[PDB]
Amino acid sequence: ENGRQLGEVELQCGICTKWFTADTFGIDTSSCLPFMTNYSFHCNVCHHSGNTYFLRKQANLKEMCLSALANLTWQSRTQDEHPKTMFSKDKDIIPFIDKYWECMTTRQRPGKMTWPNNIVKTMSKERDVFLVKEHPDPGSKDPEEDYPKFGLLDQDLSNIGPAYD
Ligand SMILES: [Zn+2]
């Protein structure tokens, strides 16, 4: 319930703070992702013009990790027999960011980028958002090669949204 459609492209309005499904306004979502925080949105009831306001911003490193992890978590929860909450930096997160780049940013990708080298320190400095695992747990049969691994501290995905005030 909660008036939420998790896994859909949802947008939160910065004025009334309520949640909306983008396509109910006919907003084009071909380059949108569920669990974005890099936008500002006003619904048509709140906005002075009586139309929607949808400002798309360029995702910073933290937003890319967060959206990647939210999406990976969601897919796993709803599609995996045995859902994972911890994901491989190299096998999961980077490939997600690569695949869905254009839904997060309009920056071109000339030559080799530096962002891959920097997401680990991005997540590691925000352990109130991100769970970090450099190595498998003592006793774990987890292959060392998939580490380090990352996850969301908060598993309530409904909590993800833009940093309004
Ligand atoms: Zn509103």
In the chain, the domains with their CATH numbers are 1-165 (3.90.980.20)
Cα 12 to ligand 1 centroid, rounded to whole Å: 8
C-alpha–C-alpha distance, residues 19 and 3, integer Å: 7
Q: Tell me the technique behind this structure.
A: X-ray
C-alpha–C-alpha distance, residues 73 and 63, integer Å: 15
Cα 129 to ligand 1 centroid, rounded to whole Å: 26
Cα 56 to ligand 1 centroid, rounded to whole Å: 17
- The candidate with the shortest Cα–Cα distance to 87, out of 104, 101, 70, is 70
C-alpha–C-alpha distance, residues 54 and 62, integer Å: 21
Residue list, CB under 5 A from ion ligand 1: 13, 15-16, 43, 46
Contact in structure between 80 and 162 (CB atoms under 8 Å): no
Task: Provide DSSP, the chain.
Answer: -TT--TTS-EEE-TTT--EEEGGGGT---TT--TT--SEEEE-TTTSTTSS-EEEE-PPPHHHHHHHHHHHHHHHHHHH-SS--S-EEIIIIIHHHHHHTHHHH------S--SGGGTHHHHHHT-TTTEEEESSPPTT----GGG-SEEEES---GGG------
Cα 53 to ligand 1 centroid, rounded to whole Å: 10
Q: From the CB of residue 69, how many other CB atoms can be counted at a distance below 10 Å? A: 26
Beta strands 149-152 and 130-133, pairing class: antiparallel
Cα 44 to ligand 1 centroid, rounded to whole Å: 7
Cα 48 to ligand 1 centroid, rounded to whole Å: 11
Cα 42 to ligand 1 centroid, rounded to whole Å: 5
Tell me the resolution in Å.
2.1
- The candidate with the shortest Cα–Cα distance to 154, out of 69, 81, 38, is 69
Cα 45 to ligand 1 centroid, rounded to whole Å: 6
Cα 16 to ligand 1 centroid, rounded to whole Å: 4
Q: From the CB of residue 94, how many other CB atoms can be counted at a distance below 10 Å? A: 16
Contact in structure between 96 and 71 (CB atoms under 8 Å): yes
Contact in structure between 16 and 43 (CB atoms under 8 Å): yes
